[PDB]
């Protein structure tokens, strides 16, 4: 028995071109925690932010600095806090040598301009302004680049940032919430270092997914984290181009998932082993109560150590989580509407959706706003296949079934990305609140760039 | 506990 929910035969580690992680010989160092991006101005009703994509240099390994890109920093980005109900104004500035896109993955905003996908280019040296008001539950989202094609290369350079959404309900729960002390991002990525400590996407390119052997956690090699509280909230984001993370602690220390892509979970779910596909988020609580000062607990993926938790002195907490975290209010399907069938096909260069590759001017589907529809999403890859993380812009969906059976224990909240196993049909409940144009695609980023993407137009009827 |  595998400890994870996905189908073992389909794990990334069965690919012929699989790249194992190796522990780097680089020095151990403190986990970089990206600072909170300070607003330009904030009132209760409004918040103003400037977000600048920029090119710089980061000391990742001894010797030469790695050339990297980031938002408001050299690599990755400062964490951006949004609040449900607050009118948000954002100045998007591009100081890169390439055009880019500012994609708010999981933010229910209008498409395709505010959404910041393929049709929202910001050229070098120019600025754009956007505004929106999030009307969605508290969760962890993220920002990343999304020029079509060239998404994979821009993310590789380092254009990803964690986005936190706050709401009244979540503020009232007994959760670690002191950012950088007991509540931290865990942005899981891999890279390959070449001569002079540089990255080289083009040398490492593979149409089925790029992965390197060195794990990078919040832009840090060989990180440790100093624990100064009994409980810690980890916001896991899989920011890798392709790699799956199979997370567990030494000695199978339990942890509890309280959150998924789009919302808190309806109920807490206890885990010893958690698998995350690309773009998935999982918020977990780890209780270090059994441990004493000077102890050490290692977070692993498979047999490879990722992050070392060094236990300092902490005040007792021993709080309980309620049995119910969040009320999931499922919409009613519109019974006039057919079941939508979406089929992901191919591997390597042959990836496609419903028989076609992406065309920027072509609309592939329509759906009325405010009306929930069943989407049946199929991964048609015969064995041996791979888990395809399917993502829909502009919405948070609910998962109803997997091959006619229950979703996984941690998939009863709102989600925007779901891993579809080979041969599997998952049934989703999908509603768009806002009119415009939205993409759906595989979130193995090389698959997206290789054309495994379609666009849907939503309209007011 | 090795993994896989
Ligand atoms: Cu206003
Ligand atoms: Cu404005
Ligand atoms: Cu994304
Ligand atoms: Cu997205
Ligand atoms: Cu184990
Ligand atoms: Cu996308
Ligand atoms: Cu794919």
TrEMBL record, chain A:
Ranges for domain Plastocyanin-like: 56-168, 334-457
Record carries keyword Metal-binding: yes
Manganese keyword on record: no
Pfam families: Cu-oxidase_2, Cu-oxidase_3
InterPro entries: Cu-oxidase-like_N, Cu-oxidase_C, Cu-oxidase_fam, Cu_oxidase_Cu_BS, Cupredoxin
GO molecular-function term, one example from the UniProt record: copper ion binding
Position of the signal peptide: none
CDD domains noted in UniProt: CuRO_2_CueO_FtsP, CuRO_3_CueO_FtsP
PANTHER family membership: BILIRUBIN OXIDASE, CUPREDOXIN SUPERFAMILY PROTEIN
Record family assignment: Belongs to the multicopper oxidase family.
Record-given protein name: Multicopper oxidase domain-containing protein
Source organism (scientific name): Pediococcus pentosaceus
Lineage, highest ranks first: Bacteria, Bacillati, Bacillota, Bacilli, Lactobacillales
